[PDB]
Amino acid sequence: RPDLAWLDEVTMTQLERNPYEVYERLRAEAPLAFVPVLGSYVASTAEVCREVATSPDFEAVITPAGGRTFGHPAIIGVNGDIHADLRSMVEPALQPAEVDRWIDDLVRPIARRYLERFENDGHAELVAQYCEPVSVRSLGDLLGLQEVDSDKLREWFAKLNRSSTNAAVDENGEFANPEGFAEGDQAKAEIRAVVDPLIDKWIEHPDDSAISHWLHDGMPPGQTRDREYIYPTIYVYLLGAMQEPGHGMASTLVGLFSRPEQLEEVVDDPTLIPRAIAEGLRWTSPIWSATARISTKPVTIAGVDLPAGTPVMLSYGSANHDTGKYEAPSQYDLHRPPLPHLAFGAGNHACAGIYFANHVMRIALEELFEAIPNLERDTREGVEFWGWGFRGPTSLHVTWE
Template identity: 85%
Template sequence: MTTVQQPTTGPDLSWLDAVTMTQLERNPYPVYERLRREAPLAWVPVLGSYVASTAEVCREIATSPDFEAIITPAGGRTFGHPAIIGVNGDIHADLRGMVEPQLQPVEVDRWVDDLVRPIARRYLDRFEGRGHAELVAEYCEPVSVRSLGDLLGLADVPSDTLRRWFHQLSASFTNAAVDADGEFTNPEGFRPGDEAKAEIRATVDPLIDRWIAEPADTAISHWLHDGMPPGRTREREYVYPTIYVYLLGAMQEPGHGTASTLVGLFSRPEQLEEVVDDPTLLPRAIAEGMRWTSPIWSATARISTRDVTVAGVDLPAGTPVIQSYGSANHDTGHWDAPTEYDLHRPPLPHLAFGAGSHACAGIYYANQVMRIALEELLETIPNLERASGDGVEFWGWGFRGPTSLPCTWEV
């Protein structure tokens, strides 16, 4: 990512000099609320980048022909090249063409129920009769990682290992703090991701060897073969960065989206009761949960391809902008009382899955995983309650979700 110096004109944003990465990870909302009010496009020193914080500016940049995708420095350090979220042109077209066939709604509908529902039931069987569970670690994350792991072809990798990998990759990807020279302030913060990638390579390389010789009906096998001339496959080094993208973002999003939706429903008990009584409301409940706490909160970026002015800010060609979709989804210009979860708010399009040509390829798949997970949970345990009245802790700036969700029920 290009290093760009902080602008010297415009509103006084010196308060941003004191913003820390720890502050953003714990609770980014106050900083971004002020940014939306004072400077919808602003240079944030700790990130070494401009940040777009409103729905209007995020959508304008995401869909503008004057910008193209770029990966954040920490993301690039974590995934390598060519990761599907940070490339353009023919490479992006090839990678999207590689992953999208398995994610088309008509294709997902063919297998998603048979894939996800038995997994959800299996995890529910472990604690249904116990009367209590910590749902992030015991249900939401495991159902998410197991479903995607099986889809990718990693059926023999334990769910706990998949969860650990995505947490390690997340720690690396969000190790974003830089100094005034654009250098990472915590180089050791990439160690967890590096260790995870070494394990991933040791596990997946033998599978790739087998799938090259004997194609299988797994996503990674299709990525190697589909669209290639007879007798040829894509190089594994070309595919690995997108495998890492999936093992982080695609595993994290349904699990944390499910958990955030539950937390939102718990904040409105009458709405939780409505959903229990009428499961057809679940898609709407999930859409509001994704808006309320976007799992991919601020993890994608764009770079200007020419000199351009956005939100009154002159950006030279080559200027990176981080898209803060979690902030955009709390924009009071689009939603009334956006900090509140409300199943019945008008269903305006949110930005939790991004926008433009780099919008998430797995939108339909992720929504179906969340729907099935919540259907099974609320049908099996309709009297589900939070274990205490204390607030739920959320964590993360790049990726965000509840850290835990203890619940109880009568058995």
């Protein structure tokens, strides 16, 4: 596409540090565009993302670096009968009525546990000390990984993050940085060493943990799903399910700090926390561009005639700054009207844990503002956001009296 020759000069590093400038151009110039360094078409607007995600002429496909990292059958990358089975496998503990039965007793004590370590220090780095630990500990306990230290869970999602977003390709469409997959392989090897003994145990002695239910639910008597069949979805969980609620909380905090009167309102009136989180998810989408669909027949989208078999990456983080939908989208605004957003995706492969994730983020922020209501950002330290596939702040230094 000749007028997009400037896309040839876009680098992976640039997209990781800040993708919003490139994607603002894409939204205006080519809502569906082939990005050479990513080796793929990408959808940048809300209209195109939603259309691709819900179209009957498209089905799920894993991103190339996602597939190299997760293998088969990752719930995000399969369709038909296998997807239906994996959806019914993960859905019971995520059902709203079920979450409402125990989410409070799960997350609130965990939030208190981590707050107690620093709430009187007067200084903290909330990503490492609060947002990520609460996120991984809550889901870890739900999964049956109580004995896996929160530092380990955080290290796993960081390595799987970097591996699955190791997307750069060279002039011949080959992965430019194949060594970047090695730490994804190392994380998987460690996960196998830890989780395989637990699966051995759950096969014979099922309990209340989610993974035990993944092995047993809906199976003939005495039978379990093969572990190779469920491991890629375990990996999917140990990346995005572990990582995203922590990044959603932190981005919401960074956005509130950017609007000090709005932060005061939320501390004064914690019933506004769910609305603050929804704006946070739109403002810096935790899953920014990590999933994709592939066309199953010839289709025309945003004026581009796509052949069958064409992958399209869904850059929901860009769709969420669509100026056809939002005014001044790069500005966090609690009082934006409650409009649809794509931070949870859309269609048959839309996020399965929305209700759970929203409560995890809500409860964590509630307990934070109660313990430290004079929270202030440490304006001596800058907040840098990182990631093209998954995006969030690398740290969040705060102070208080």
